[PDB]
Amino acid sequence: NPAESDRRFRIILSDFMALVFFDKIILRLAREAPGVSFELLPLDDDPEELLRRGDVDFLILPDLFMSGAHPKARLFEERLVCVGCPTNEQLQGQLSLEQYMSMGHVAAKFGRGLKPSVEQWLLMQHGLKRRIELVVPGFNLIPPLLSGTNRIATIPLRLVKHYERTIPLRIIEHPLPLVSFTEAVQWPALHNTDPGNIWMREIMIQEALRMESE
Amino acid sequence: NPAESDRRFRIILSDFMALVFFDKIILRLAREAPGVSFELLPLDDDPEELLRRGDVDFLILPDLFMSGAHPKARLFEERLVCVGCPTNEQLQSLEQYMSMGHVAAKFGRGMQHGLKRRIELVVPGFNLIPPLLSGTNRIATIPLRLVKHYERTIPLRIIEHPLPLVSFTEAVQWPALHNTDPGNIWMREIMIQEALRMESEM
Amino acid sequence: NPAESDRRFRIILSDFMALVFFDKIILRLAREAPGVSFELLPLDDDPEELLRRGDVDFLILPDLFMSGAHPKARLFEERLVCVGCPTNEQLQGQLSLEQYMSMGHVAAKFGRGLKPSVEQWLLMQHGLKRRIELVVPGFNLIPPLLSGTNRIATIPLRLVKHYERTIPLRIIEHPLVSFTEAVQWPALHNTDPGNIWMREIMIQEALRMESEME
Amino acid sequence: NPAESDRRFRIILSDFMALVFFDKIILRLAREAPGVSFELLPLDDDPEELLRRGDVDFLILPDLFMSGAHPKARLFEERLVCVGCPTNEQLQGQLSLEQYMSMGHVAAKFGRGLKPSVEQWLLMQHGLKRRIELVVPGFNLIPPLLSGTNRIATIPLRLVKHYERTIPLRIIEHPLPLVSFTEAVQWPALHNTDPGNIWMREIMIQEALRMESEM
Amino acid sequence: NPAESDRRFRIILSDFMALVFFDKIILRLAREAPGVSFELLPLDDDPEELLRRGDVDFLILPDLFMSGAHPKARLFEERLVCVGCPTNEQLQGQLSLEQYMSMGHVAAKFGRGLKPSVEQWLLMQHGLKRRIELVVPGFNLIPPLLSGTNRIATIPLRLVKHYERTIPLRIIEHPLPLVSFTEAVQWPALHNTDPGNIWMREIMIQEALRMESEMES
Amino acid sequence: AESDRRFRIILSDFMALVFFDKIILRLAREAPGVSFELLPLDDDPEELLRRGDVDFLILPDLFMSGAHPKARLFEERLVCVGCPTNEQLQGQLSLEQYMSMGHVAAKFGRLLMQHGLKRRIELVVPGFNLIPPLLSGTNRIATIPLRLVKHYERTIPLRIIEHPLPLVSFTEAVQWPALHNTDPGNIWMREIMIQEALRMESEM
Amino acid sequence: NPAESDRRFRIILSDFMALVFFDKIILRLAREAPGVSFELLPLDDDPEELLRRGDVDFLILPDLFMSGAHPKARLFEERLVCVGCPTNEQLQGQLSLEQYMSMGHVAAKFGRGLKPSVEQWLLMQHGLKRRIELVVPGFNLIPPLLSGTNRIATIPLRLVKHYERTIPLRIIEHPLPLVSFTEAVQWPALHNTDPGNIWMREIMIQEALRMES
Amino acid sequence: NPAESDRRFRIILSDFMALVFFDKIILRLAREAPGVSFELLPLDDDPEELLRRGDVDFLILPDLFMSGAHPKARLFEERLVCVGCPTNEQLQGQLSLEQYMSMGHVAAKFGRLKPSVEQWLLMQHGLKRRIELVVPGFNLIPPLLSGTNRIATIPLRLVKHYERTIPLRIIEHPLPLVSFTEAVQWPALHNTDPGNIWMREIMIQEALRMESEME
């Protein structure tokens, strides 16, 4: 049976991916197969161990982190942007890093063991002293809380397109380049032979391709 | 001088709350005191111990989970409602026994005695439920305020239910070892002002 | 020969299955293999781990509660029915859902399920107005403690038959909930001839049983 | 007043005392105090430590299992007897001590239990020997599982009566002294005076008196 | 040449064995081997993990506690006995099963143990209800703290003869059979070929032969 | 007074043999229903006290918590010993000669780069009570509390050495859980202990 | 009086502050208050948790790392200069832009640390790159080890001047903004008033101005 | 393939060992293998376990503090000496046990209980400490002993590194001289990693150039 089993699958992803990726995927299988269930989950600190053993069936995440001890398929690429509130005023006209420094910034959890202290010593040792005034858990909350303030942030670009209708966002000429990145999904080794996980992976890669047509 | 302070506070709350509540505190204070920063964490560890040791500042859950020797307060009341998408056929009976698709949230990390049903999806927090439900024709239950928030963005439609509504109590708690700290007091006053300015407006 | 041995098996199972099912195996074996020993353990903890390490021989449980980490086999199917005391003078009628809920409830608590707080929120506003007035450890105390009172409970049907000649109970049609009992074993023991010997006998008696109840 | 309240109590007891004692109290109170709830919790290896943490109201055990740090109150005395299946045809006659300790035993276990080696080390210190062929959790399952086999057990006398219409048993004569223990209830020592707690105590010590009066 | 070594051995053993057995072995290896050094270790609850992990050189226990996961060798047999203070007047004669069960008992805890809830339920279901008045850590304190009180205890017989001069004790006649156990020494399996592990374990096996002849006579 | 409570005390092998055997006899004639359980020390006594898992712990003052009530029992002196058969200790120890000698040591509660010394340790036992019977018959030396030397004066004879360095003494205390301060059972027992401590310093 | 006490204070400070700053205090208090003793403790990822447990008297740190929930003081200022070895040529005053951003850096780690992967995400959050080749525990080692090499580092300016006599180094005018921060000392809040606390605070404020001029 | 790698090695060592040794290692490798990176972790916790879990590659500390069950190799030998500031007065001639036992001492602390320290001291040691300053490591001892009447104990080689800046006065204690052996340990499941074998060979080399030239 290709896609009509009662097999629950366990996925580990970020809120950005769920709201830009799996939403389509759930709609495909919604009409096509009402037999499969899922259980989205959040990112721990040792996701691999969960993969060393089994439990979860996938880990969608930026690749720079994924290790080489397990399968790894490629999905799509995304870039980052420095956004800010339209109502802000000092942001009309490209500005120096000086302003970037002074202006306050928002940021995301990116994990669990934040230990906010260490990051500064680093960036400051490279020549940047940013003042983080608001830390939140994830990306999806950056757009709603920023609007109405004199603060700026760095988020993936696909996000600002999602909120164009509801939250007017202002793409900003950053004083420095905007390295981008690729997204991947990895299946626990010792299970590349399962019947169906392959079908799932296919579903995913497929949508990714579809999604790259823009 | 509270307007010119640089305290950073650590608050544990839920997405729902952040969007429909602390957002308001964030904005005001943004103009009435720019020097103050925040850090919003999610519910993981049994909160008790964090409190017992002073590892956080505040804590915004419904009154149930909250308990102990630690000081508490009160905010607002919340209605629980059951919804679907505007594109379902059957939603226009207990025979249906809500035997359709149910999407749930999952608080915390890690029985048909009365009855059991079908659970299509399982999402960490309440916020995603509305989007991901999309037009799947599955059903779920969320706070009425979250329903009210997506009115001009995500048109859903509230269902009835044979079973009466439930309502619960949002409130803020803090470490008992912190009850007498100028910082802490200044903050909980401001949360209580916005909670009260809310109920009075409707 | 495993039939003339001294082995000691360790089984995790509920008080229901010990009384209704595992009695027979003990008898047969007492005369057929008088050298074997047992320890019956209470269902009081995530078993997955004890299986993983293989410190137990079998786990007998409802099928829906089992993981896919380790092999399993079907035993028989069992039905949940709702009961009341035949003295309960409000049972002569129809059960408007309303009344049902308004009525008093006795419940089985297998394990150590957190603190009421969550438990209360675990009602997750599913509609749960069930007023739980008595919570007991297994299933087997429910008949003798609900007898003589105006309370109702949901228990498996063969347990009602077991007490037919000492505790009369009245089956009620709540405004079918069925499941499959099963036996699971650690993966490392799948070809241990002792497991094969034992798991075969179990499967036989199950068949006898479901032979009659049909 | 307590009898007209919505109070919920949490008691720790064995399956023997739930069946043979707390049943008449659940029944009486279902009528006389229809708002009072109950949660019965199982017994473990260190039961008094839950007392200390503070979540439970009472704890019902034999007497010899209690330290004296917490308050208590007696209930009734209870005798253990040695029973076998009447079909088994060796229990008739007299059991030389050697014959008794050479027979298969069914034994009850409250808590996680212990390794077989350690059981053997303990029985050795007193001249005994390990012939335990079946270990079950609690006292109530034993009479069902002794039936139709050649094994023997030691259970409370009051539980023999319970089963006497469905499961008749042979009371045996072993040249060992009689074992008896007194049952009792205890409650947390650093608890502030509550009149609901004093009410529930009174109901237990009254049911205890009926049981003693009629044996 | 292993007598001229500068090595440290780690041994896991009870205080009873450290006194009746290992005092002799340390004495000689003070003349015949003046470079060796020992660390005596208390007994935990899973002494076996320490073997696998290779952190200790030997483990000495009664064998009914030992596994198949590591090589082992036998040392000697040892008898259990029942004792009491000579002052106690009730002890004159042969104790009845009633009177044995109706006196105060002293007991040692070998591992960490548990509330005797376990032990008591186990023993009541065999027809003994004993009353344990004092629980100590290890056999060696029993004879000092038994002395003076009108209590009894079950200790190994070589401990009785050790304190035979310092602390007088009376041997009672239990109304039930009593038995003997076998002491053994066990070692890691990554070391069945280590030279020092072989040298030391012949010393232990020689000393244990002495002991079944100093006791035979 | 007389009752039937079980107390749980954490103490050393030395304090049991020297100090606690008094209490036991006294109570056997004045409270024959009291019973004890003596346990050894592992670690984090603080938690076992905060949680109320034990009744008392008996040990030197330095280790005591700062968050639970205590009381002073007595003082004890550390002294250095060797065997009488050793024939290098028939004279006063030269600091060199001592420092290059074989040492029995005691390891409590289950190291450090000492700057200024070099000690050779050839025997590590758990506790103090095995040091006398094991050193007896060899040419090693150890540091043990003085009441233990006195305890074995009649069965394990030992030579006290005029150590080259100064002598230290310590005071033995008793602590009990903050939430047990009003327990009438805890109060009756801690009084009997402080009574027997005082009868020692006077009989001396 | 506290200057005749036998008191013992516990200070959490970085190795840099222990040499520039607290050396002077040690000498004066060795003479003016010969009864006093100190125990110095290393820095960490979350030092404040130690104030909260409460067996430490003081914590010295840049203010920007401070939460603001404990009483604080002020001390002096410092400027982070970029450095390099006089034995390298590229640094022919040929200051450039990205080139510097593409050279070996010796970084300092106060704490357990972050996995290399994580570091990148953060630096990428801004327009930067990770080219770390050496991670050392303190700061006081970055110089002695940079010597004889061809990499660049960022260190405190008083540190450069501590070594101008022995470890030559050439400041680099990077195109990046300047960076300065304020050093501070704080003490446990939720503490009972003690004159020894007050007295120690004074000595630190005095020595902070003597070196500021 | 040859020394044109990209590898990151993780080494645990004291501050003293990173100043007197790995500097050289770094220099050499910079010129001979630009592609390798380092991370000097500091000494704390239980070194092992890291090894068992295979999280570091090396562990440099004196051989006396090293376990077995992991491969080791000898680097070189070092002697501990007693030092003071030349400004001090009493620090001349010679000191009897009394004088040494009655001065201010600076001390190095590698790792992380405050009262449990003193009791381990007074045991079998007559340890009248009078510890007046405690720093985390060694390399800070010379800068903070400059200008005090106190005495310390540091490795001789460190004294020589600090000659052109901070002078000292080696003094004869009435106590025995002390020497120890520095050494390097690698995890056991890496005993045959080509990467690890390369690196431990370079180390042993500089450790003989040091012994030979600097004797």
mmCIF file of N, CA and C in Angstrom, chain A residues 62 64-65 80 96-98 100-101 105 108-110 113-130 139 154-156 174 176-181, chain G residues 43-47 61-62 64-65 80 105-108 110 113-114 117-132 139 142 154 176-177 179-181:
data_model
loop_
_atom_site.group_PDB
_atom_site.id
_atom_site.type_symbol
_atom_site.label_atom_id
_atom_site.label_comp_id
_atom_site.label_asym_id
_atom_site.label_seq_id
_atom_site.Cartn_x
_atom_site.Cartn_y
_atom_site.Cartn_z
ATOM 1 N N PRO A 62 18.608 23.706 9.198
ATOM 2 C CA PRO A 62 19.713 24.222 8.395
ATOM 3 C C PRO A 62 20.868 23.242 8.398
ATOM 4 N N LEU A 64 24.212 23.587 8.032
ATOM 5 C CA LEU A 64 25.498 23.904 8.640
ATOM 6 C C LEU A 64 25.668 23.165 9.936
ATOM 7 N N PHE A 65 24.568 22.691 10.486
ATOM 8 C CA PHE A 65 24.624 21.985 11.740
ATOM 9 C C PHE A 65 24.614 20.476 11.540
ATOM 10 N N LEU A 80 18.565 35.776 4.085
ATOM 11 C CA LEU A 80 18.160 36.568 5.222
ATOM 12 C C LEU A 80 17.985 38.024 4.859
ATOM 13 N N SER A 96 25.003 54.163 8.414
ATOM 14 C CA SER A 96 26.242 53.514 8.769
ATOM 15 C C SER A 96 26.088 52.428 9.765
ATOM 16 N N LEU A 97 27.134 51.636 9.892
ATOM 17 C CA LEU A 97 27.117 50.599 10.882
ATOM 18 C C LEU A 97 26.886 51.277 12.205
ATOM 19 N N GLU A 98 27.319 52.522 12.321
ATOM 20 C CA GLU A 98 27.194 53.211 13.582
ATOM 21 C C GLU A 98 25.771 53.128 14.055
ATOM 22 N N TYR A 100 23.481 50.962 13.031
ATOM 23 C CA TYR A 100 23.147 49.574 13.264
ATOM 24 C C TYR A 100 23.483 49.265 14.697
ATOM 25 N N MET A 101 24.652 49.702 15.137
ATOM 26 C CA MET A 101 25.065 49.438 16.494
ATOM 27 C C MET A 101 24.091 50.032 17.479
ATOM 28 N N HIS A 105 18.085 45.685 18.811
ATOM 29 C CA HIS A 105 17.720 44.539 17.993
ATOM 30 C C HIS A 105 16.888 43.477 18.673
ATOM 31 N N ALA A 108 16.078 35.592 18.140
ATOM 32 C CA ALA A 108 15.310 34.378 18.362
ATOM 33 C C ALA A 108 16.046 33.370 19.202
ATOM 34 N N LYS A 109 15.315 32.408 19.740
ATOM 35 C CA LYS A 109 15.921 31.439 20.636
ATOM 36 C C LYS A 109 17.031 30.663 19.996
ATOM 37 N N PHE A 110 16.757 30.064 18.850
ATOM 38 C CA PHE A 110 17.759 29.229 18.226
ATOM 39 C C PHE A 110 18.263 28.221 19.236
ATOM 40 N N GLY A 113 19.608 26.108 25.352
ATOM 41 C CA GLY A 113 20.640 26.605 26.245
ATOM 42 C C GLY A 113 21.231 27.883 25.721
ATOM 43 N N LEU A 114 20.449 28.948 25.744
ATOM 44 C CA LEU A 114 20.910 30.201 25.182
ATOM 45 C C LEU A 114 22.159 30.730 25.839
ATOM 46 N N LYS A 115 22.174 30.801 27.164
ATOM 47 C CA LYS A 115 23.313 31.394 27.849
ATOM 48 C C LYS A 115 23.650 32.673 27.122
ATOM 49 N N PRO A 116 22.748 33.659 27.168
ATOM 50 C CA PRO A 116 22.950 34.896 26.400
ATOM 51 C C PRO A 116 24.336 35.531 26.534
ATOM 52 N N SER A 117 25.035 35.295 27.630
ATOM 53 C CA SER A 117 26.333 35.926 27.852
ATOM 54 C C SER A 117 27.401 35.666 26.811
ATOM 55 N N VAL A 118 27.615 34.410 26.471
ATOM 56 C CA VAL A 118 28.715 34.081 25.569
ATOM 57 C C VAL A 118 28.703 34.783 24.216
ATOM 58 N N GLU A 119 27.539 34.942 23.613
ATOM 59 C CA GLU A 119 27.493 35.532 22.285
ATOM 60 C C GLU A 119 28.155 36.885 22.256
ATOM 61 N N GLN A 120 27.939 37.710 23.244
ATOM 62 C CA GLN A 120 28.479 39.029 23.157
ATOM 63 C C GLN A 120 29.973 38.997 23.132
ATOM 64 N N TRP A 121 30.577 38.245 24.012
ATOM 65 C CA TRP A 121 32.019 38.271 24.069
ATOM 66 C C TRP A 121 32.558 37.993 22.711
ATOM 67 N N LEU A 122 31.799 37.282 21.907
ATOM 68 C CA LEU A 122 32.310 36.901 20.617
ATOM 69 C C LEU A 122 32.200 38.052 19.698
ATOM 70 N N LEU A 123 30.982 38.436 19.414
ATOM 71 C CA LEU A 123 30.796 39.466 18.454
ATOM 72 C C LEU A 123 31.627 40.674 18.817
ATOM 73 N N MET A 124 31.828 40.905 20.099
ATOM 74 C CA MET A 124 32.555 42.084 20.517
ATOM 75 C C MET A 124 34.021 41.903 20.259
ATOM 76 N N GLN A 125 34.445 40.659 20.154
ATOM 77 C CA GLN A 125 35.851 40.382 19.944
ATOM 78 C C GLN A 125 36.138 40.484 18.465
ATOM 79 N N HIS A 126 35.084 40.541 17.668
ATOM 80 C CA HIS A 126 35.253 40.697 16.235
ATOM 81 C C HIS A 126 34.991 42.130 15.825
ATOM 82 N N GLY A 127 34.471 42.935 16.743
ATOM 83 C CA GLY A 127 34.240 44.340 16.449
ATOM 84 C C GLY A 127 32.796 44.757 16.327
ATOM 85 N N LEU A 128 31.911 44.045 16.991
ATOM 86 C CA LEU A 128 30.519 44.417 16.954
ATOM 87 C C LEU A 128 29.929 44.354 18.354
ATOM 88 N N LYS A 129 29.234 45.406 18.767
ATOM 89 C CA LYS A 129 28.641 45.447 20.092
ATOM 90 C C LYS A 129 27.184 45.783 19.979
ATOM 91 N N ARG A 130 26.362 44.781 19.742
ATOM 92 C CA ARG A 130 24.969 45.010 19.566
ATOM 93 C C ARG A 130 24.263 44.900 20.858
ATOM 94 N N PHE A 139 11.162 32.392 15.219
ATOM 95 C CA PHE A 139 11.070 33.464 14.236
ATOM 96 C C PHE A 139 9.665 34.008 14.060
ATOM 97 N N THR A 154 17.016 40.531 12.082
ATOM 98 C CA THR A 154 17.406 39.767 10.897
ATOM 99 C C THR A 154 16.574 38.489 10.849
ATOM 100 N N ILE A 155 15.755 38.334 9.813
ATOM 101 C CA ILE A 155 14.925 37.139 9.671
ATOM 102 C C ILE A 155 15.062 36.589 8.256
ATOM 103 N N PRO A 156 14.694 35.317 8.045
ATOM 104 C CA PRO A 156 14.637 34.795 6.679
ATOM 105 C C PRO A 156 13.665 35.591 5.830
ATOM 106 N N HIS A 174 21.389 46.804 4.378
ATOM 107 C CA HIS A 174 22.317 46.491 5.454
ATOM 108 C C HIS A 174 23.717 46.984 5.079
ATOM 109 N N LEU A 176 26.372 45.580 5.391
ATOM 110 C CA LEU A 176 27.253 44.455 5.128
ATOM 111 C C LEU A 176 26.515 43.388 4.351
ATOM 112 N N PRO A 177 27.251 42.430 3.779
ATOM 113 C CA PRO A 177 26.609 41.425 2.922
ATOM 114 C C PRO A 177 25.601 40.556 3.646
ATOM 115 N N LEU A 178 24.788 39.829 2.888
ATOM 116 C CA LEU A 178 23.759 38.994 3.495
ATOM 117 C C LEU A 178 23.909 37.556 3.085
ATOM 118 N N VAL A 179 24.881 36.877 3.674
ATOM 119 C CA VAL A 179 25.079 35.480 3.373
ATOM 120 C C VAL A 179 23.756 34.767 3.479
ATOM 121 N N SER A 180 23.534 33.788 2.608
ATOM 122 C CA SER A 180 22.296 33.040 2.642
ATOM 123 C C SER A 180 22.569 31.612 3.023
ATOM 124 N N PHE A 181 21.588 30.748 2.833
ATOM 125 C CA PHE A 181 21.768 29.380 3.279
ATOM 126 C C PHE A 181 20.804 28.379 2.668
ATOM 127 N N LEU G 43 36.053 33.224 35.679
ATOM 128 C CA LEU G 43 34.799 33.665 35.081
ATOM 129 C C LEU G 43 34.034 32.461 34.547
ATOM 130 N N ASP G 44 32.819 32.692 34.076
ATOM 131 C CA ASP G 44 31.940 31.589 33.715
ATOM 132 C C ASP G 44 30.949 32.082 32.668
ATOM 133 N N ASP G 45 30.083 31.167 32.209
ATOM 134 C CA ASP G 45 29.025 31.522 31.267
ATOM 135 C C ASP G 45 27.880 32.253 31.948
ATOM 136 N N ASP G 46 27.603 31.909 33.200
ATOM 137 C CA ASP G 46 26.545 32.543 33.988
ATOM 138 C C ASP G 46 27.110 32.753 35.380
ATOM 139 N N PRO G 47 27.854 33.843 35.590
ATOM 140 C CA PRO G 47 28.424 34.064 36.920
ATOM 141 C C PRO G 47 27.367 34.423 37.943
ATOM 142 N N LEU G 61 32.960 42.692 36.195
ATOM 143 C CA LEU G 61 32.553 42.343 34.845
ATOM 144 C C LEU G 61 32.245 43.621 34.099
ATOM 145 N N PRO G 62 32.288 43.594 32.772
ATOM 146 C CA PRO G 62 31.664 44.671 32.001
ATOM 147 C C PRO G 62 30.183 44.778 32.328
ATOM 148 N N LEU G 64 27.663 45.603 30.450
ATOM 149 C CA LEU G 64 26.692 45.160 29.452
ATOM 150 C C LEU G 64 26.274 43.713 29.673
ATOM 151 N N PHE G 65 27.136 42.905 30.294
ATOM 152 C CA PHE G 65 26.762 41.547 30.660
ATOM 153 C C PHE G 65 25.883 41.490 31.906
ATOM 154 N N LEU G 80 39.002 48.259 23.191
ATOM 155 C CA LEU G 80 39.466 47.034 22.557
ATOM 156 C C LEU G 80 40.200 47.362 21.265
ATOM 157 N N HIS G 105 42.236 34.442 13.288
ATOM 158 C CA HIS G 105 41.992 35.163 14.525
ATOM 159 C C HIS G 105 42.180 34.294 15.746
ATOM 160 N N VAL G 106 42.737 34.850 16.816
ATOM 161 C CA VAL G 106 42.858 34.116 18.061
ATOM 162 C C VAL G 106 41.820 34.667 19.007
ATOM 163 N N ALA G 107 40.842 33.857 19.387
ATOM 164 C CA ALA G 107 39.755 34.334 20.237
ATOM 165 C C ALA G 107 39.877 33.883 21.672
ATOM 166 N N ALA G 108 39.159 34.545 22.567
ATOM 167 C CA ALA G 108 39.196 34.186 23.973
ATOM 168 C C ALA G 108 37.869 33.616 24.381
ATOM 169 N N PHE G 110 35.470 32.655 27.562
ATOM 170 C CA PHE G 110 35.200 32.686 28.975
ATOM 171 C C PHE G 110 34.022 31.781 29.214
ATOM 172 N N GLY G 113 31.790 27.291 26.371
ATOM 173 C CA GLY G 113 31.948 27.569 24.961
ATOM 174 C C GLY G 113 30.805 27.161 24.068
ATOM 175 N N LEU G 114 30.879 27.548 22.798
ATOM 176 C CA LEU G 114 29.853 27.195 21.836
ATOM 177 C C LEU G 114 30.469 26.357 20.734
ATOM 178 N N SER G 117 29.766 25.280 14.927
ATOM 179 C CA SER G 117 28.614 25.468 14.073
ATOM 180 C C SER G 117 27.760 26.605 14.560
ATOM 181 N N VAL G 118 27.480 26.625 15.851
ATOM 182 C CA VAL G 118 26.598 27.643 16.380
ATOM 183 C C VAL G 118 27.178 29.014 16.160
ATOM 184 N N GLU G 119 28.457 29.155 16.438
ATOM 185 C CA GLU G 119 29.088 30.442 16.288
ATOM 186 C C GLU G 119 28.734 31.011 14.947
ATOM 187 N N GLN G 120 28.787 30.180 13.923
ATOM 188 C CA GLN G 120 28.538 30.675 12.580
ATOM 189 C C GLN G 120 27.161 31.265 12.433
ATOM 190 N N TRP G 121 26.141 30.569 12.902
ATOM 191 C CA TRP G 121 24.803 31.078 12.665
ATOM 192 C C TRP G 121 24.719 32.487 13.183
ATOM 193 N N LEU G 122 25.276 32.719 14.355
ATOM 194 C CA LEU G 122 25.187 34.034 14.950
ATOM 195 C C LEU G 122 25.946 35.069 14.139
ATOM 196 N N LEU G 123 27.187 34.771 13.784
ATOM 197 C CA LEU G 123 27.993 35.734 13.049
ATOM 198 C C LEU G 123 27.376 35.974 11.702
ATOM 199 N N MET G 124 26.663 34.983 11.194
ATOM 200 C CA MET G 124 25.998 35.126 9.915
ATOM 201 C C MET G 124 24.766 35.982 10.066
ATOM 202 N N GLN G 125 24.179 35.974 11.254
ATOM 203 C CA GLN G 125 22.993 36.762 11.484
ATOM 204 C C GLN G 125 23.389 38.150 11.106
ATOM 205 N N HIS G 126 24.681 38.422 11.152
ATOM 206 C CA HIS G 126 25.166 39.701 10.690
ATOM 207 C C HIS G 126 26.102 39.369 9.552
ATOM 208 N N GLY G 127 26.663 40.369 8.905
ATOM 209 C CA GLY G 127 27.492 40.088 7.757
ATOM 210 C C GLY G 127 28.921 39.779 8.114
ATOM 211 N N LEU G 128 29.168 38.596 8.662
ATOM 212 C CA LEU G 128 30.518 38.271 9.104
ATOM 213 C C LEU G 128 30.883 36.829 8.856
ATOM 214 N N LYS G 129 32.145 36.495 9.073
ATOM 215 C CA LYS G 129 32.604 35.147 8.809
ATOM 216 C C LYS G 129 33.417 34.591 9.958
ATOM 217 N N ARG G 130 33.445 33.272 10.084
ATOM 218 C CA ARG G 130 34.190 32.647 11.160
ATOM 219 C C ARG G 130 35.518 32.130 10.669
ATOM 220 N N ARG G 131 36.596 32.726 11.148
ATOM 221 C CA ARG G 131 37.910 32.294 10.752
ATOM 222 C C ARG G 131 38.714 32.175 12.004
ATOM 223 N N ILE G 132 38.250 31.331 12.912
ATOM 224 C CA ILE G 132 38.935 31.167 14.173
ATOM 225 C C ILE G 132 39.842 29.984 14.068
ATOM 226 N N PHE G 139 42.693 35.786 28.397
ATOM 227 C CA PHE G 139 43.037 36.846 27.478
ATOM 228 C C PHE G 139 44.506 37.015 27.618
ATOM 229 N N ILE G 142 46.576 35.289 24.907
ATOM 230 C CA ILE G 142 46.433 35.604 23.508
ATOM 231 C C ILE G 142 47.686 36.292 23.004
ATOM 232 N N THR G 154 41.921 40.651 19.130
ATOM 233 C CA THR G 154 41.302 41.843 19.723
ATOM 234 C C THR G 154 41.422 41.766 21.240
ATOM 235 N N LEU G 176 36.369 48.880 10.998
ATOM 236 C CA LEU G 176 35.220 48.653 11.869
ATOM 237 C C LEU G 176 35.096 49.757 12.916
ATOM 238 N N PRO G 177 33.898 49.960 13.477
ATOM 239 C CA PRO G 177 33.752 50.975 14.530
ATOM 240 C C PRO G 177 34.664 50.671 15.713
ATOM 241 N N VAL G 179 35.296 50.163 19.803
ATOM 242 C CA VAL G 179 34.500 49.509 20.840
ATOM 243 C C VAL G 179 35.124 49.772 22.207
ATOM 244 N N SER G 180 34.296 50.278 23.127
ATOM 245 C CA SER G 180 34.661 50.510 24.513
ATOM 246 C C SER G 180 33.521 50.052 25.403
ATOM 247 N N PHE G 181 33.863 49.767 26.656
ATOM 248 C CA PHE G 181 32.907 49.266 27.631
ATOM 249 C C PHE G 181 33.337 49.723 29.018
#
